[PDB]
Design a binder for this molecule. Structure first.
Ligand SMILES: Nc1ncnc2c1ncn2[C@@H]1O[C@H](COP(=O)(O)OP(=O)(O)O)[C@@H](O)[C@H]1O
Lengths: 69, 248, 69, 245, 239, 232
């Protein structure tokens, strides 16, 4: 509500995903998307930045070791 | 401290690992054998009575060893499984070698001999499972035998193990009946004690398992009671309980 | 002369300039959790008469628990 | 300056974007509507120059700088490990803005004993100090580690020390720049075969090059006084190779 | 997060075998990384050949080993354990061929190898071998296949894979490549592997700095391209 | 309990074998897999979600057969699962060689659990940190058994191990009716993994094995895709 979001940014396509992201994760998804929009000197957060940031906060596994599964 | 290995003797002479295995039976299930002539029974309890548990065995706590021997179990599941496998193997070995059924005590002696060996040789955890035995023989007839994870055993007329073992044995002693212990009275006493030693009241039939051994025409039929007869037994106990409230 | 006691910030009691600045509407969802917390730590202070009208002492402690974030 | 540390241009730029921006021009962050990011995590081989990077940022921003050995703060006595973080943060509250550069966190960041639950308690105290109650504040942290997998996942969050910057051993082209900045001050009229030194210094870390320069100066001290020959750089590299092992 | 660890047989309270975990962090001790990518009709493996001296016999510095005429492997990890794994795999493949009458599929090969490594994880007798096996070979009716199988004993089929210090970066770049689907011809596969190693290392790759092994369906034989061939491939990559 | 959690042959003062519990916790931190027993047959489902697109999804199968009428699924250490499946196949083949009849599910699960117990009785060998769900079609009644590293084999009608297993069991006892059939057993099994699987249900991410009158068989990706389009 305080973030400057482009009209093409439809929040529903991210809230309907089955990933069990927490409220802290949600705030992370928002803040890092805004950060990515800032990096490109853009003053409006686009859906591309939201999708890019959405992939970096839900891939928490990353390291793992592939043999605990 | 002196409980690192099962072969370590404490300065007071106490095998701490053994007693740790002994006291762990409090986490085991409730199985009891009541006094009874011309018969004998065990009354087990099903902790895991979750609805998603399909029932296939109907004897998860009741095992038959010989054609005239049955035993319950109270301890670690894997230990109980291997112990009952060894039980059946030893009973069948005796049957093959002597062409005669094992006479109750010598089978229990065999298990206790195997069990104590784990408490003496290093590198093996003591068998943390105690188990009742029932059976009949041409020597002493119906007997009730108490296994104990230390390899110690003992003849018994009425005993219980597992959760609330002390309460169960005290209640069995409260109404302890010698001689006049007909099978109906034994079943009634088993239901009556299970009503209190089990925290859950009303003694649901599906959560209570009774196995009986009787001498019928020299066959020693080992019976596990189905849901209908357990239901009528708990019904009999309930009707008897209603009369007991007339005092007030 | 007796001087008024000095216990303004002995153990970091929140001063007028240390308000967290977090509105109830700022936090998202948590409607049941907000109501239960508001019903033990905020409502009793204001509407104590409504608590006393039924005969119950207001609950004194709450424990918020759950996954991190 | 940022030119003093050589070959980290990308990593330098990310660290500037993370820390310099909220402290110099917060108007961008408030115009976008996001709380300014706080905290950057530099991970890499030891001696690669993360501390030098932190000092460069604290020098350009002209702000007070706190450097702490995180392994030192975990003391045997209970509660002092978290107490040190507490005093550090309340100290940063008074003197603002602050660069809270913490050393190898693997001691603090990343179970059935009191001493192990002490590390848990100091970890919770740390995460509470960075993100949480009282004042969200404007100070920044340059908390750097040696082993990034050990670090707690909660310790990696946007308002909670995000942006894992990788600072690997000096890059292949970075060795030349490092030798230029750390050997140029040293008087040397003779030509340099820098590629030969770089190939003879494989697996070297940033501090090793500075020791090479200082020790070449020492060789000159034990001699005429003027740096004239490449054989000096060769033997300096070898002794900074075998004697620094 | 040290944990119980010290004995490989001891589970941590959370349920992770810390000692087996450190085998993976022992894998990247060698400072080298090997990249495998599966093409439409071939599989190629590229490794790091960093000879840190002028006195080393460059012929024997190879990280590529030929287990069987149809299957080859590349090593990333401690050199001694990697050679021991090579020797064990050669014996396993020979035993399979002698016992069942036909050459071992690449999948069964370090299915067996990972089975050996798994027993080492359970029984506290052998210290686990800290090295990964990346296997390539043309098996009929499934074409080329690539298998990366770790000290912990987990094997899986990879359209492309890489193990080493630069393992995460390489697998990320492959993530970028295999997705924009294209004709994965042999030259394209070699180009993809070369680009992988070059991008993750940012090295111009002098022809003496790498060793590439090729297995193709047309000639199902493990071949290590000589210096001139990899020079030509690097030139074709340049333009 | 604190210093005795290391050894698996040392009883705690409360007599708790803590190492077995830690192996079970390792089981609870695996990939969620669900099996439910229908009046028509048994269906087992698991998520083989690779860490990258780079993996060959058809390379390694989790839902695997032992005999023509028995299949396995697991939630835990895959390398440990492979040795388990090898020993289970060997035991089934040994029974077939001696009795000439296919192994009944109860007996096979009993001997597999006995194999599990063999690794939890001496120091130096680790318990098999995987829990196994086993189906069977024999003597005209379906079976579904779960065997844990402790060696305790159950008779689950419908269960789910792995991550978010509590929520998986919570889903059951709600949409699981005893008088169901195999066709809706597939839909229930796919639904159960849906509450835990973080992502879209793509045909190479959920592997299902039906264990019907004809026998156990791992579903090909096309049929899984058909069911997955039906449910979605
Ligand atoms: N990349 C680099 N460029 C220039 N100098 C460096 C570099 N890395 C290290 N140094 C030198 O090494 C010294 C100490 O390095 P330090 O900051 O302690 O490394 P780290 O932070 O990795 O421990 C510094 O005084 C600096 O002059």
């Amino acid at each position: 509500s305080k973030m400057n979001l482009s009209e093409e940014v439809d929040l529903e396509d991210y809230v309907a995903r089955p990933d069990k992201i927490s409220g802290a994760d949600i705030n992370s998804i928002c803040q890092e998307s805004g950060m990515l929009a800032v990096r490109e000197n853009r003053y409006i957060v686009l859906a591309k930045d939201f999708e890019k940031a959405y992939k970096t906060v839900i891939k928490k596994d990353e390291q793992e070791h592939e043999f605990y599964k | 401290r002196y409980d690192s290995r099962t072969t370590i003797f404490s300065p007071e002479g106490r095998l701490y690992q053994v007693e740790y295995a002994m006291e762990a039976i409090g986490h085991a299930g409730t199985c009891l054998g009541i006094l009874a002539n011309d018969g004998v029974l065990l009354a087990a309890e099903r902790r895991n009575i979750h609805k998603l548990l399909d029932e296939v065995f109907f004897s998860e706590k009741i095992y038959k060893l010989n054609e005239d021997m049955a035993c319950s179990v109270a301890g670690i599941t894997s230990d109980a499984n291997v112990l009952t496998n060894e039980l059946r193997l030893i009973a069948q070995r005796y049957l093959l070698q002597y062409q005669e059924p094992i006479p109750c005590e010598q089978l229990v002696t065999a298990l206790c001999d195997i069990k104590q060996a784990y408490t003496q040789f290093g590198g093996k955890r003591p068998f943390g499972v105690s188990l009742l035995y029932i059976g009949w023989d041409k020597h002493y007839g119906f007997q009730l035998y108490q296994s104990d994870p230390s390899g110690n055993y003992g003849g018994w007329k009425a005993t219980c193990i597992g959760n609330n073992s002390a309460a169960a044995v005290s209640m069995l002693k409260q109404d302890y009946k010698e001689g006049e212990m007909t099978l109906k009275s034994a079943l009634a006493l088993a239901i009556k004690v299970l009503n209190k030693t089990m925290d859950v009241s009303k003694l649901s039939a599906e959560k209570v398992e009774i196995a009986t051994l009787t001498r019928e025409n020299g066959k020693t039929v080992i019976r596990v009671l189905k849901q209908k007869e357990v239901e009528q037994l708990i019904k009999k106990h309930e009707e008897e309980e209603a009369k007991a409230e007339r005092e007030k | 002369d007796v001087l008024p006691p000095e216990a303004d910030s002995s153990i970091m009691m929140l001063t007028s300039d240390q308000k967290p600045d977090v509105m109830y509407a700022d936090i998202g969802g948590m409607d049941i959790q907000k109501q239960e917390v508001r019903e033990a730590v905020e409502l009793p202070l204001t509407h104590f008469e409504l608590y006393k009208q039924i005969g119950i002492d207001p609950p004194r402690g709450v424990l918020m628990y759950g996954p991190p974030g | 300056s940022y030119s003093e540390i050589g070959g980290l241009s990308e990593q330098i730029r990310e660290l500037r974007e993370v820390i310099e921006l909220p402290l110099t021009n917060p108007e961008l962050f408030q115009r976008v509507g996001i709380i300014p990011p706080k905290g950057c995590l530099l991970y890499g081989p030891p001696g690669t120059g993360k501390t030098l990077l932190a000092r460069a940022v604290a020098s350009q921003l002209d702000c007070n700088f706190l450097k702490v050995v995180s392994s030192s703060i975990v003391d045997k006595y209970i509660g002092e490990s978290a107490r040190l973080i507490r005093e550090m943060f309340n100290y940063a509250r008074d003197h603002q803005p602050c660069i809270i550069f913490m050393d190898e966190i693997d001691a603090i960041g990343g179970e059935g004993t009191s001493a192990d639950r002490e590390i848990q308690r100091t970890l919770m105290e740390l995460l509470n100090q960075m993100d949480g109650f009282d004042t969200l504040h404007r100070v920044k942290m340059i908390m750097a580690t040696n082993r990034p997998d050990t670090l707690d996942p909660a310790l990696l969050r946007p308002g909670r020390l995000d942006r894992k910057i990788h600072i690997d051993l000096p890059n292949e082209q970075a060795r030349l720049d490092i030798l230029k900045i750390h050997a140029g001050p040293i008087t040397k009229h003779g030509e340099i075969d820098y590629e030969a030194i770089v190939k003879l210094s494989d697996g070297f870390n940033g501090a090793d090059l500075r020791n090479v320069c200082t020790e070449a100066g020492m060789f000159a001290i034990r001699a005429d006084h003027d740096f004239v020959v490449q054989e000096d750089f060769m033997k300096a590299v070898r002794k900074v190779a075998d004697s620094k092992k | 997060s040290a944990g119980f660890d010290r004995h490989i047989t001891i589970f941590s309270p959370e349920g992770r075998l810390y000692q087996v975990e450190y085998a993976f962090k022992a894998i990247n001790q060698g400072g080298l990384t090997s990249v495998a990518v599966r093409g439409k009709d071939c599989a190629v493996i590229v490794t790091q050949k960093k000879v840190p001296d002028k006195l080393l016999d460059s012929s024997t510095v190879t990280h590529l080993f030929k287990i069987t005429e149809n299957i080859g492997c590349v090593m990333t990890g401690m050199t001694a354990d990697s050679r021991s794994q090579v020797q064990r795999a050669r014996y396993e493949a020979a035993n399979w061929k002698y016992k069942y009458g036909y050459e071992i599929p690449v999948d069964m090969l370090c299915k067996r190898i990972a089975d050996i490594s798994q027993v080492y994880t359970q029984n506290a007798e052998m210290r686990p071998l800290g090295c990964c096996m990346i296997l390539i070979g043309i098996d009929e009716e499934q074409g080329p296949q690539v298998y990366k199988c770790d000290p912990a004993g987990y094997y899986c089929g990879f359209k492309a894979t890489a193990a080493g210090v630069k393992q995460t970066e390489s697998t990320s770049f492959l993530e970028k490549k295999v997705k924009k689907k294209f004709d994965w011809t042999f030259e394209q596969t070699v180009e993809t592997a070369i680009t992988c190693l070059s991008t993750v290392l940012s090295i111009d790759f002098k022809p003496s700095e790498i060793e590439v092994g090729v297995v193709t369906v047309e000639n199902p034989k493990f071949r290590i391209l000589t210096e001139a061939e990899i020079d030509a491939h690097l030139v074709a990559l340049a333009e | 309990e604190r210093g005795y959690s290391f050894s698996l042959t040392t009883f705690s003062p409360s007599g708790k074998l803590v190492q077995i519990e830690y192996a079970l916790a390792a089981v609870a931190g695996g990939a969620p897999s669900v099996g439910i027993k229908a009046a028509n047959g048994v269906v087992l489902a698991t998520e083989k979600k690779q860490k990258s697109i780079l993996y060959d999804e058809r390379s390694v199968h989790k839902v695997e057969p032992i005999t023509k009428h028995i299949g396995l699924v697991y939630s835990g250490m895959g390398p440990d699962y492979r040795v388990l499946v090898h020993r289970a196949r060997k035991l089934a083949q040994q029974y077939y060689l001696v009795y000439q009849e296919p192994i009944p599910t109860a007996q096979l699960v009993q001997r597999v659990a006995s194999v599990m117990q063999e690794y939890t009785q001496s120091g130096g060998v680790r318990p098999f940190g995987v829990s196994l769900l086993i189906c069977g079609w024999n003597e005209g009644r379906p079976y579904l058994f779960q065997s844990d590293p402790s060696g305790a084999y159950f008779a689950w009608k419908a269960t789910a191990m792995g991550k978010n297993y509590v929520n998986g069991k919570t889903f059951l006892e709600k949409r699981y009716n005893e008088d169901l059939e195999l066709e809706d057993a597939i839909h229930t099994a796919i639904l159960t993994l849906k509450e835990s699987f973080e992502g879209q249900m793509t045909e190479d991410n959920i592997e299902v094995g039906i264990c019907n009158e004809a026998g156990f068989r791992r579903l090909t990706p096309t049929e899984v895709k058909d069911y997955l389009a039906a449910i979605a």
